[PDB]
RNA sequence: GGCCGGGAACUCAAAGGAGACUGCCAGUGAUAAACUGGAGGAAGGUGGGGAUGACGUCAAGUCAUCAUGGCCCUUACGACCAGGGCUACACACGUGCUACAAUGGCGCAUACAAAGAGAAGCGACCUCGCGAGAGCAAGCGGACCUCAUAAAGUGCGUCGUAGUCCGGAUUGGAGUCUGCAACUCGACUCCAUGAAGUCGGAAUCGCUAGUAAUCGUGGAUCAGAAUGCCACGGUGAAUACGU
C-alpha cells in the first residue's frame, strides 16, 4: 500500500520439530482453516522423506527447499505498446515463500492416492532435481537470464 | 396429503347433492366449485362439471378417478406454446 | 420472602432497591443483599426507507434490568409495610411468599 | 454485443425494438470488444429520453440523450457513445 | 455372482454389490444380509454356492427388475390416460411436483433449445 | 500458600492455581494429554514453564469454561503467566519479553448490515 | 497503511523521477533544505542514466 | 389501508373468538383416534359448516395506526415505519438506538 | 451428583470507580507544530468495532405506509362472496445454495461454545413408532424450567481414485403434521429411483487479521411455509517489494 504496514505477526514454531519455518509450510498447505488436518499431512510426509533419505527431517525437508528456491524473478512493466519483463533480486523471505508454495502447488497436481504421498514424493524428487516444482524455478530463471539487458532501469 | 386418521375430505354441499344423484336417479351434470373434494365411489358414473376459474368443465367420473380431487381434472391455465 | 425488581432505567432501579433495603432495615428485619441479575436486551432491526433500499436500517434495543432482594427473618411489622409502599412508576415489583 | 431493452413509461413495440437494435449494431465498428449492454427509454410529461450502459473489455460506458421523439432521442444517444467508445479504444491502442 | 438374472460385482462388499439389483437400495441390502444371515463386509467372490442361494431366496421376497420396471410404467401410463394435471406434466415432460419452470427445470426439459 | 491467576483468550476464561511439586497438571478433573488432543494446545499450555524451567518443580491445577480448544489452551497460558509472575515477581521481565503477559484482545468482529459477514460484501458483476 | 513511509527516501525518488522524465531542477517542491537535498540528489543521479537510455 | 380492509379484520376477530370453543371441541373429536367413526365423520361435516372468517388463521396482523399489512412487529403492534416515527419522539419506553 | 452442611476466595452477574494523556525518555525539527525510536503498561499514539452523514447534487426513490394541493369516479374506479391468478414457460440476465470427491464418503466411539426465544406460549420425563411424529402430561413469565445432544474436531474401522460406497437432481410408491381446506400451490418422513456434473471461454467479484476461507447455533416475520435477511460463537490462513 501507499503507506507502510506496521505490525508483523508471530508464527508459533512446530509442536514437534520446533521450527517457525515448518510452521509457515503448514499454513501454506492448510485449507479452509483446518490446521490439524494439515499438521498431520505434513508430518506423515516427512516420516516418509526421513525413511528413505535417512537424513533427519528438519534437515532433509531443507534439501528439497534448496533445490527449488529462486534467486531472480521477473516483474512486468508496460513500455510503449509493449510490456517489459525485467529481472530483479529476490528477498530471502520471499524465496522461502515461493519454494514452499511451488512445492505445494506441484504436489497437488499429481495422481497419487494420499495427499501425504504426493507431498512426500514431491519433496523427494525436489531433492534430486526432478519434479514440476523444480521445473518451475528453472523456467523462472531462464526468463530473467533472457532479458538481462533490462536489469538496470528503475522505470 | 391429509392425515389418514382425519378421513377423506369432501365439502358437504357437494356430498349431499350426490345422494340425490345416486338415490333419486337423475342423469344431469352438476355444477360445483368444490375442487377440494376427493372423489368418492358413489360418484362413479355421474358427469360433474367442476369450475376451473372461469368455466365449468365436465368430468365423467370412473373407477380410476377415486381418491383424487375434482380440481385435478379441471386445468386452470391455457398454454399452447411460444 | 423474595422481591424481584425490574425496570428499563438503571438509575431508577438502584433507587427502589435502596428504598426497600432501607424499610427492611427499619421494620426490624435482615435483608439478604440486593443482588443484580442478567439484563435482557431485546433488539429490533427496521427498514428506515418507506420503499426499496433494503440495506438502510436502524438497530433499536430495550435493556431490561433485574434486581433481587430477600427477607431473612420476616418481622410481622415488615410484611404489611413492604407490601404497602407506593413505588416509582415504571418499576415492576413481585413480592412473593 | 448482447442487448437488453427496458421501458420506463413506454411500450416497446416492434419498430422501437427493431429500430434500436439496428442503430446499436454500428457501435461495434468503434470498438470490437463490446459485451452485454442495457438500454432504457423514458417518457416524463413531454421529455423523451434514452440512456444505455455498455459493458466493454475493461470499462463501463454510459450516456443518455433527450429528443422530442424517442427516435430522435436514440439518434442523439448513438452519437454520444460513438465518441466515448473511440476515446476508450485509443487509450488502449496507445503505442 | 448371478442374482435376479443379472450379474453382480464379485469384488464388492455384499452390501455394496447387492445394490446393483434394480429395486434394492441400501436399506434392503442391509436387511437381505441378515434375513439371510450373511455378513456385510464379506465380498461376493468368497462365498459358497449355498450362501449365494439362501441369498437368492431373500431377494425374491421383493418386487425387482423387469417386474418393478413394469409396475412403475403402469402407474405412469395410468396417470396419462386419466389426463389429470399430474398426467400431463408427464406428457409435456415437465416438473410434476410443483417446481418452478420460469427458470431452471432443466432435468425434465433437458438441455436448452435456443430461439430463432 | 498457593498462587493464582485468571486468564482469558477470545471467549475463554481459565482460573489456575499453582503449587510447589514434581510437575502434575489437572484440567477439569482430567489430565493434560486427555483433555487436549491437539499437540499445538499442549505446546502452548507448557511453554511459559518450558521458558523458566519450572516444568517439573511446580505442580499446577486448572479449570476452564467457555471458548473452544485454542481459546482455552491460550487462556490457560495467560493464567499461568499471571500466577507464575506472582509466586515470583522476579520472572515478569523474562515472561514479558516472550509476549505472554499481554491479554490478546482480538475478538470476533460483529456482523454488519448489508454484508454477508463482518467485511465480506455481496458480489456485483460488471461482466 | 498504518504508518507513513520515509519522507527522505520518497523525496529522493520523486527527484529521480522528475530527473529521468527531464524536468528542470527548480521544479523541486521542497524548501525544507533536508528534503531538498534528497530531491536534487535523485535528480542528478537520474541525469546520468538518461544518457544511456533511448 | 382501505377502510374496508381495516374493517374485515374486526369482523374476522369478533367471529374467531365467539366460535372459538365450538371449533376447538369440534376439532378435538376429529383428532381422537380412539373415538366413534360415526362421531368423527359427523364432525368433519360440522366444522366445515360454521363460518370461514371464524378461523384464527384467517386474520392478518395490521399496524394498529395505519393499517399496513407488511413489516409488522408484535412487541409494538405497529409497522416498522410507525415504530421508527414513535421511537424517535421517545413514545416507546426504553427503546433507543443501539451499538455493539 | 456443588450432592450436603458450609464457604464469599475464585469464575461470573452489574452498579460504581481507576486507566492512555504523545504524560515520561532519547534523536531529528524554524528556540515551533510535529516526526522516528525507547520505557513502563492489559492496552500506545484515532488500541479494536459501532452510532454519528456538512452546504449541496441527481425536477434520484416513495401520492400503494401515512399525510396532502389539484384532478377524476359516485346503482361504481365504492361494497360483499366463491373459484382462479400473482407459482404460467421456446428463452435472456442478476443474486445464491449444493456439488464435481480421498485435506474426502460411510459406520461406530468421544471432546470443547456464544448469543437468543418462551404464556396460554417453551414443553421435559414415560409409553408407542424404522421415521416424520402420536399419547400422556412434570417444570418454567425463566442466571432456576423448556427449546437444546453444537459442528467442524478427535480415535478405530472401512472405501482405493471409479462417473465410484463421489453427487442427490428427477420420478413412482407409501406416510406425518399445520390448517374449514394442502388438485392447481405447503413443510417434512420412509422405501425405490440415482440425472447433469471430472473444477468451468471471453470476461468478472470479495477480502489487509480473529479478516478471508470454512463449521455449526439463534432470531424477526410466522397456523404451516428460508438455500433469503438480521444476529452469535468454533477452527483460522495467505501476502503488501513497492507506486
Ligand atoms: Mg431470557
Ligand atoms: Mg444520426
Ligand atoms: Mg434412499
Ligand atoms: Mg441484499
Ligand atoms: Mg464467523
Ligand atoms: Mg385512507
Ligand atoms: Mg397468516
Ligand atoms: Mg512503544
Ligand atoms: Mg465525529
Ligand atoms: Mg422522476
Ligand atoms: Mg378471494
Ligand atoms: Mg412474485
Ligand atoms: Mg459455496
Ligand atoms: Mg452417496
Ligand atoms: Mg419461532
Ligand atoms: Mg422408539
Ligand atoms: Mg481497507
Ligand atoms: Mg451459515
UniProtKB/Swiss-Prot annotation, chain A:
One of its GO terms (cellular component) is membrane. InterPro entries: Ribosomal_uS7 (IPR000235), Ribosomal_uS7_bac/org-type (IPR005717), Ribosomal_uS7_CS (IPR020606), Ribosomal_uS7_dom (IPR023798), Ribosomal_uS7_dom_sf (IPR036823). SUPFAM superfamilies: Ribosomal protein S7. CDD domains: uS7_Bacteria. This is Small ribosomal subunit protein uS7. Keywords: Ribonucleoprotein, Ribosomal protein, RNA-binding, rRNA-binding, tRNA-binding. Changing residue 35 to A/E: Defective in ribosome assembly. Pfam families: Ribosomal_S7. GO terms for biological process: cytoplasmic translation; negative regulation of translation; ribosomal small subunit assembly; translation. The strain K12 sequence is shown. Has been predicted to contact the N-terminal domain of IF-3 based on footprint studies; exactly how IF-3 interacts with the 30S subunit is controversial. GO terms for molecular function: mRNA binding; rRNA binding; structural constituent of ribosome; tRNA binding.
From Swiss-Prot, chain B:
Part of the 30S ribosomal subunit. Binds S13 and L5 and cross-links to the A site tRNA. GO terms for molecular function: rRNA binding; structural constituent of ribosome; tRNA binding. Gene3D superfamilies: 30s Ribosomal Protein S19, Chain A (3.30.860.10). It comes from Escherichia coli (strain K12). The keyword RNA-binding applies. The keyword Cell membrane does not apply. Keywords: Ribonucleoprotein, Ribosomal protein, RNA-binding, rRNA-binding, tRNA-binding. Belongs to the universal ribosomal protein uS19 family. One of its GO terms (biological process) is cytoplasmic translation. The gene is rpsS. This is Small ribosomal subunit protein uS19. GO terms for cellular component: cytoplasm; cytosol; cytosolic small ribosomal subunit. NCBIfam families: rpsS_bact. In the E.coli 70S ribosome in the initiation state it has been modeled to contact the 23S rRNA of the 50S subunit forming part of bridge B1a; this bridge is broken in the model with bound EF-G. The 23S rRNA contact site in bridge B1a is modeled to differ in different ribosomal states, contacting alternately S13 or S19. In the 3.5 angstroms resolved ribosome structures the contacts between L5, S13 and S19 bridge B1b are different, confirming the dynamic nature of this interaction. Bridge B1a is not visible in the crystallized ribosomes due to 23S rRNA disorder.
Swiss-Prot record, chain C:
GO terms for biological process: cytoplasmic translation; regulation of DNA-templated transcription elongation; ribosome biogenesis; transcription antitermination. The keyword Glycosyltransferase does not apply. GO terms for cellular component: cytoplasm; cytosol; cytosolic small ribosomal subunit; small ribosomal subunit; transcription elongation factor complex. One of its GO terms (molecular function) is transcription antitermination factor activity, RNA binding. Keywords: Ribonucleoprotein, Ribosomal protein, Ribosome biogenesis, RNA-binding, Transcription, Transcription antitermination, Transcription regulation. The keyword Ribosomal protein applies. SUPFAM superfamilies: Ribosomal protein S10. It holds the Pfam family Ribosomal_S10. It comes from the Bacteria. PANTHER family: 30S RIBOSOMAL PROTEIN S10 FAMILY MEMBER (PTHR11700). Belongs to the universal ribosomal protein uS10 family. Part of the 30S ribosomal subunit. Can also form a heterodimer with the transcription antitermination protein NusB. Binding of S10 to NusB is mutually exclusive with its incorporation into the ribosome. The rRNA transcription and antitermination complex (rrnTAC) consists of RNAP, NusA, NusB, NusE (this protein), NusG, SubB, ribosomal protein S4, DNA and precursor rRNA; S4 is more flexible than other subunits. This is Small ribosomal subunit protein uS10. It comes from Escherichia coli (strain K12). The lineage of its organism: Bacteria, Pseudomonadati, Pseudomonadota, Gammaproteobacteria, Enterobacterales. The gene is rpsJ.
Swiss-Prot record, chain E:
The keyword Glycoprotein does not apply. One of its GO terms (biological process) is cytoplasmic translation. Changing residue 104 to K: In PW097; partially suppresses a rimM deletion. Keywords: Ribonucleoprotein, Ribosomal protein, RNA-binding, rRNA-binding, tRNA-binding. One of its GO terms (cellular component) is cytoplasm. InterPro entries: Rbsml_uS13_C (IPR027437), Ribosomal_uS13 (IPR001892), Ribosomal_uS13-like_H2TH (IPR010979), Ribosomal_uS13_bac-type (IPR019980), Ribosomal_uS13_CS (IPR018269). GO terms for molecular function: rRNA binding; structural constituent of ribosome; tRNA binding. The keyword RNA-binding applies. Residues 93-116 are annotated as: Disordered. Gene3D superfamilies: 1.10.8.50, 30s ribosomal protein s13, domain 2 (4.10.910.10). Part of the 30S ribosomal subunit. Forms a loose heterodimer with protein S19. Cross-links to the P site tRNA and weakly to the A site tRNA. Forms two bridges to the 50S subunit in the 70S ribosome, contacting the 16S rRNA and proteins S19 and L5. Belongs to the universal ribosomal protein uS13 family. Located at the top of the head of the 30S subunit, it contacts several helices of the 16S rRNA. This is Small ribosomal subunit protein uS13. It comes from Escherichia coli (strain K12).
